[PDB]
Design a protein around this ligand. Sequence first.
Ligand code: HEC
Length: 104
Amino acid sequence: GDVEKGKKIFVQKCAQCHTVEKGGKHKTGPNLHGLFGRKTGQAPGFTYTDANKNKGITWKEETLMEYLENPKKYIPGTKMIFAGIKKKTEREDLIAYLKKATNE
Ligand code: HEC
């Protein structure tokens, strides 16, 4: 749960299409503020695939751990183009960082 290595993974691997700050803007991928604790496909103003919208699960560490590994497998037909973070640590790191930054 190194929030400090998580941030690197985020910038190196998510920042292209995503913003985590409040008031932050939708890029290719939506803004992730208020992520934790909300259903999938909830960011306002963004245009979700119907999959991402109907997944209907709640984001929190458990569902993230699972999604980051093969997003396409977690939400088949998701417009997000991203293979997944294979190693568990990275995924905990990156989850540590999002729990933090999408809530601050
Ligand atoms: C651009 C090519 C992306 C990269 C790199 C990452 N994500 Fe993304 N993300 C992208 C899109 C276009 C979408 C919506 C896709 C759809 O089918 O609707 C998403 C969605 C997410 C979500 C969904 C959450 C929700 O509100 O439903 C999450 C939690 C998410 N993305 C996180 C995430 C992380 C942590 C990434 C880095 C490893 C990452 N994404 C990469 C576009 C792109």
